[PDB]
């Protein structure tokens, strides 16, 4: 009561949401937007009873040299067990959302792709789906604004969501006279820069790196480099990266086999060029905490580690089984995982020099398109064939400022004595070499 | 809409749930989908009287901060409701 | 009461961990509009004049 | 040993306040933060209402003969959480917050 | 010397929020210019058959409409690209012998939204403009200032 | 005035006719509305 | 502490050369290479099973034709079994007795299918130019998901480096335009549909023979071409031509149907006159 | 020296003449550096400005490389064979042979 004549006292911004309801009489009576928030809770926490023995271990199980991994939940549907999980992503804003983009490989089998953005919160179905007309290949989120997300699928059309948008058809779409790249699109992934609007690059199989501009109604198009000896046509690209350290060095991995370092600068000339691999590289990607250092997973089953003024590979990792994709951890430096056949295997260079520190089989009836890392917690994610993505916790034996717990009292050494570590022990391969 | 109509479906589809009731703010059956009909009557009549009561208590510690989901736990069932000014949805979900 | 207040507190604990392991209640972009939409450049003929 | 508790429940990620009561409704033992005696008193009657009332319409207006309440969990508007337990004859209202309202509350002391 | 258009001069204007800034509408392709500078700026393409009429959005510095014998209206939104035409629209099968705009509004119609074309035929047509055309963009002024005092720089 | 293909027929007369009968029902419709709007204020008052 | 790098080793027998070095200055040298030619063994014998088990249903690269991706594979296990080689000589007959075998199948392999496969593209490619579902009633592209197979295998056998019969590398030649013009036709038909749903159901009777203008420019672009025209380029600009004056056409008639005539309808219907 | 001065004016803007201006940048590091004549002096003798030489012949190969790359860009912006000429104009004599 004396709220309301205060409101009467001061009428400064009245009170809207105006009482028009849905109404209808009876089929379907309001159910809608305060209603539907309650209605979303309740199915949360109705879960939340059924998962609580999983729910009080994924928090705080806490899972020298040995590593275990444990595979908590599994996020799948029955009428979707054709499609592959392919790419996966993480909402930079918010750690529990996260982005998988089930589409087709295999090529001689093609049937549409549906993105499902899967909460930690609701293990059950997605919080969002988006139906495409192709397999959706690649999935990224954009550092600032995590409403903006990165779509590319077969016959390389390039699709922007909002999250935000109720509708859910796509926000921009690529056509043929906004020169949209023929084949696929294997990676696509968001510039951090937004002084030039929105910036958004897109690799294809064709083998065009494209940098694409967001406008009001229309997408620009501009070719940042061609991937390029006595053969036809251009060079074939499976994956690209750029350096977080320099905006304008950024990686390329081919289907030739042969990686690539690129400047956005100079569009006809290479920087460097890998001769290490021998068969299509899978997917590049620069080390956490230091420039000039990154890893590649080819179909030739070995895993290498380059340092970018060396033209070879500093170190390999031959495993017997195919090499599907390798990604670094966020919170250490001079750790990665590489899935292989209903094989996950995460290494450690402090902890040893070529042994595997844990070996894992998180499902064993399908083999694993693609896994993931997430950059909050100790969390990777693990994409199976039958677009199915099952998460795993690590252990603690694994972790950074290892040789002695709290000493030196160091706030830069965690950005910094990383950067020196991966120095001290890429010293130690020269002296071996 | 398939949103709200499809998630109280598949809440009620999912295992150990006994079953998911909307009350009326006046105290009304709006949907009701239990077994035996005495037990959706009782819970009709019963439960959101215990709501109101429950909504008091919060209030009176902090009239600005109102009840946004209430969660009660018996011996053998839990009892979960999310309030809302136009509906209330009420569940009754077996311990595991 | 020194044997109740430790397995009364225990029995809190263990609610208190539950709750702490997840928001539950989170709206994920909750408020936020579209922001930047998508908006395509029409011209309306309202009326023609004529002799 | 049964201050020890109270000092372990603060020590808790989240938890602002706690309050015991008797069968009667005399509040025990209270945290400084949430006030003394004052809210205690308040706090006792809304509680020992709720709980009672609780209590009686599960063993009748339900209709299922023998099934206790043993836990309450009154989730509201901010972060608040008041937990509401029973061992033996006593009772207690913990206050927990969520991430979102303890990096505010930690920002608020800095 | 070099600015002579190809045919004669059917239009000029300049802009209400940059009076410095002055269009001329010649021939096919129309042209900006500066209140000292002897030659354009900025050339504007060519078109599909003569320009009649071209003026400046009241409101808005940045876009500018043009009315062509052809038939068709091409606006042409500076802020956003320089290169290709904003939206292009037809008005009537029979040529445009005119263009004006609204300055100043009342009632409903704000300024800049109302656009008056000429026909050959003998009909005036009024286009209501987008609410994006007529209403100023952020930090449209400014952009356009920088834009012409580079262009300054570059005759 | 559209010019399509010049072998193939213009248009049809009967569509022509369709549409002034559509467009005059769509009108005497609205007049309806219009007046039944009028009519609802007059039982109020 | 040589035993234990031994073990780890069963990569690493690159990493073997560089502690031989060191222990190159100092039956220690012999020990080595038997260690050596262990982990050489055990590597011959992983293939050696897997080969066996695999070569029914081999694991591919990602999107990667049936045929071309099982030659690719039995030719990086090739690659991978002489890589070891470079008493003594009985780890060299098993080996052979592999390297013997991959080459002289999946050489045969190769030949049964690309005769084939090659035959039956040619005519798939030579097969007008686009085809309507008669269930459908609706326009949709003719090509041949066996065209950009071989294309793509074509490429793959290129990169590798095998010869290619010059028949299967002539069309991996044009390649590059095969593809501008599917790009451009997919284009065509997703905005003949799209325009097709811009118009309003009342005039779709009314509309009716301006659509079947646009339909019957199609028609000799459709049967007349035969794909390996001489100017597909030239019909898909009279295509481009055509929709933009459907367009320009159906947005006069819709503009003054949403804007001019409903606005007075609706204005009318609320004008209440008391 | 001249580049500086350059002020094209054409379609997208500031990005390239920023572009530009780092390059300057660059450029004006570099002879900063050879001012500095350490040694030096025009000696046949000394084998110490042929390393020099060396050393500046790859730092302008780099730049020759960077405006290379700024001019393609801005041909494929004015999309006009007079705009187009006018850019050639500005750069006649700043061809790098």
């Known amino acids: 009561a004396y709220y309301a004549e205060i409101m009467k006292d001061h009428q400064i911004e009245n009170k809207k949401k105006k009482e028009v309801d849905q109404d209808k009489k009876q089929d379907q009576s309001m159910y809608s937007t305060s209603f539907k928030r309650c209605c979303k809770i309740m199915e949360r926490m109705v879960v939340q009873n059924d998962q609580e023995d999983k729910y009080h271990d994924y928090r705080y199980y806490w899972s020298k040299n040995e590593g275990h991994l444990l595979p908590i939940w599994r996020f799948s549907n029955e009428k979707q067990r054709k499609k592959n999980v392919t790419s996966i992503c993480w909402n930079p804003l918010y750690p529990d959302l996260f982005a998988v983009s089930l589409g087709s490989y295999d090529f001689t089998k093609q049937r549409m792709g549906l993105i499902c953005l899967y909460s930690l919160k609701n293990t059950t179905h997605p919080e969002y789906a988006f139906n495409c007309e192709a397999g959706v290949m690649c999935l990224d989120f954009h550092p600032k604004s995590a409403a903006l997300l990165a779509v590319g699928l077969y016959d390389g059309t390039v699709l922007v969501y909002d999250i935000r948008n109720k509708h859910k058809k796509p926000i921009y779409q690529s056509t043929v006279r906004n020169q949209k790249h023929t084949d696929p699109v294997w990676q696509v992934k968001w510039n951090p820069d937004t002084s030039k609007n929105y910036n958004f690059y897109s690799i294809s199989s064709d083998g065009r790196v494209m940098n694409w501009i967001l406008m009001k109604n229309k997408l620009e198009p501009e070719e940042v480099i061609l991937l390029r000896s006595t053969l036809i046509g251009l060079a074939c690209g499976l994956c690209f990266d750029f350096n977080k350290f320099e905006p304008h060095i950024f990686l390329v991995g081919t289907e030739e086999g042969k990686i690539h370092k690129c400047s956005r600068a100079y569009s006809g000339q290479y920087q460097e060029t890998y001769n290490g691999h021998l068969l299509a590289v899978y997917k590049v990607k620069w080390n956490n905490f230091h420039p000039r250092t990154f890893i590649s997973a080819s179909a030739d089953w070995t895993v290498r580690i380059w340092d970018s003024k060396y033209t070879s590979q500093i170190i390999c990792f031959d495993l017997s089984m195919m090499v599907v994709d390798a ?51 100790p969390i990777l994610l693990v994409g199976d064939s039958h677009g199915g993505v099952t998460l795993v916790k690590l252990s ?10 709290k000493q030196t009292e160091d706030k830069k050494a965690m950005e910094e004595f990383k950067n020196v570590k991966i120095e001290d022990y890429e010293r130690e391969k020269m002296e071996n070499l | 809409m398939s949103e709200v109509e499809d998630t109280l479906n598949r809440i009620k589809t999912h295992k150990t749930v006994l079953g998911y009731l909307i009350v009326n703010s006046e105290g009304g059956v709006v949907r009701g989908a239990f077994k035996d009909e005495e037990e959706s009557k009782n819970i009709a009549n019963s439960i959101p009287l215990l709501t109101k009561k429950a909504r008091s208590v919060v209030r009176d510690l902090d009239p600005t901060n109102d009840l946004v989901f209430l969660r009660i736990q018996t011996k053998l069932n839990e009892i979960m409701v999310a309030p809302d000014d136009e509906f209330s949805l009420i569940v009754i979900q077996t311990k595991g | 009461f020194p044997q109740a207040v430790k397995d009364l507190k225990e029995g809190v604990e263990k609610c208190i961990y539950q709750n702490n392991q997840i928001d539950l209640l989170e709206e994920y972009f909750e408020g936020e509009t579209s922001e930047h939409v998508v908006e395509n450049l029409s011209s309306k003929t309202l009326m023609l004049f004529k002799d | 040993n049964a201050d020890d508790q109270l000092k372990q429940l603060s020590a808790l990620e989240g938890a602002n306040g706690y309050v015991i009561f008797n069968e009667s409704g005399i509040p025990l033992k209270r945290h400084e933060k949430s006030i003394s005696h004052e809210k205690a008193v308040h706090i006792a009657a809304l509680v020992s209402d709720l709980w009672n009332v609780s209590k009686k319409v599960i063993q009748r207006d339900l209709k299922t003969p023998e099934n206790d309440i043993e836990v309450i969990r009154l989730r509201t508007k901010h972060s608040y959480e008041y937990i509401i337990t029973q061992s033996g004859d006593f009772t207690m209202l913990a206050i927990q917050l969520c991430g979102k309202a303890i990096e505010e509350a930690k920002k608020a002391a800095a | 010397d ?149 262009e300054y720089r570059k005759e | 005035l559209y010019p399509l293909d010049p072998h193939v027929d213009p248009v049809l007369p009967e569509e022509t006719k369709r549409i002034k009968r559509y467009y005059f029902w769509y009108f005497y419709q609205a007049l309806l509305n219009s007046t039944q709007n009028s009519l609802n204020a007059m039982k109020y008052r | 502490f040589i035993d234990n790098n031994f073990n780890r080793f069963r990569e690493y027998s690159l990493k073997l050369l560089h502690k031989f070095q060191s222990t190159i200055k100092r039956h220690n040298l012999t020990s080595r290479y038997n260690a050596i030619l262990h982990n050489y063994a055990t590597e011959l014998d992983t293939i050696q099973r897997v080969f066996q088990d695999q070569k029914s249903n081999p694991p591919l690269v990602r999107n990667m034709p049936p045929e071309a991706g099982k030659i690719i594979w039995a030719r990086h296990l090739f690659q991978k079994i002489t890589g070891p080689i470079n008493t003594e ?42 085809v309507r579902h008669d ?64 118009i309003k159901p009342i005039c779709k009777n009314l509309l009716l023979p301006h659509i079947e203008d646009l339909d019957l420019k199609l028609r000799p672009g459709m049967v007349t071409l035969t794909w390996t025209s001489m100017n597909i380029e030239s019909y898909l600009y009279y295509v481009h031509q055509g929709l933009k004056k459907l367009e320009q056409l159906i947005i006069n008639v819709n503009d003054i149907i949403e804007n001019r005539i409903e606005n007075n309808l609706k204005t009318v219907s609320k004008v209440v006159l008391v | 020296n001249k580049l500086e001065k350059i002020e094209l004016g054409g379609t997208k803007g500031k990005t390239l003449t920023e572009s530009i201006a780092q390059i300057f940048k660059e450029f004006e590091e570099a002879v900063q550096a050879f001012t500095s004549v350490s040694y030096d002096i025009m000696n046949i003798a000394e084998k110490k400005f042929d390393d020099d030489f060396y050393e500046f012949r790859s730092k302008i190969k780099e730049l020759e490389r960077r405006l290379a790359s700024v001019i393609t860009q801005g041909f494929d912006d004015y999309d006009t064979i007079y705009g187009r000429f006018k850019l050639l104009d500005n750069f006649e004599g700043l061809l790098t042979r």
């Open chain 1, 327 to 377: 990604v670094w951890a966020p919170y250490s430096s001079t750790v990665f995982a590489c899935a292989t056949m209903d094989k996950v295997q995460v290494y450690d260079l402090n902890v040893d020099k070529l042994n595997k520190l844990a070996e894992q089989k998180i499902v064993k009836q399908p083999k694993l398109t693609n896994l993931s890392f997430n950059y909050k917690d």
């Open chain 1, 396 to 405: 603690p034996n694994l972790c950074k400022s290892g040789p002695e717990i």
């Open chain 5, 2 to 150: 070099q600015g002579r258009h190809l045919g004669p001069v059917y239009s000029i204007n300049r802009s209400n929020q940059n009076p410095k800034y002055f269009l001329s509408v010649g021939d096919w392709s129309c042209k900006i210019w500066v209140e000292d500078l002897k030659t354009p700026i900025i050339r504007t393409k060519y078109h599909g058959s003569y320009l009649s009429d071209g003026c400046w959005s009241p409101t808005r510095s940045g876009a500018f409409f043009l009315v062509r014998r052809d038939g068709w209206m091409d606006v042409w939104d500076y802020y956003y690209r320089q290169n290709e035409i904003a939206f292009s629209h037809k008005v009537s099968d029979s040529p445009l012998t005119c263009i004006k705009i609204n300055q100043t509004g009342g009632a409903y119609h704000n300024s800049g939204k109302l656009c008056a074309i000429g026909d050959q035929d003998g009909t005036v047509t009024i286009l209501e403009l987008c609410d994006s055309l007529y209403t100023m963009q952020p930090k449209e002024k400014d952009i356009i200032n920088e834009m012409f005092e580079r």
């Open chain 7, 89 to 130: 000589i009985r780890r060299y007959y098993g080996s052979y007795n592999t390297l013997g075998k991959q080459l002289t199948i999946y050489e045969m392999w190769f030949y049964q299918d690309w005769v084939n496969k090659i035959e039956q593209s040619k005519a798939a490619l030579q097969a007008t130019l686009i």
């Open chain 7, 135 to 198: 269930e459908n009633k609706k326009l949709y592209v003719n090509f041949d998901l066996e065209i950009m197979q071989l294309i793509r295998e074509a490429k793959c056998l290129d990169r590798q480096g095998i010869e290619i019969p010059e028949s299967a590398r002539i069309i991996l030649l044009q390649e590059d335009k095969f593809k501008t013009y599917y790009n451009e036709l997919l284009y065509a038909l997703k905005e003949y549909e799209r325009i097709n749903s811009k």
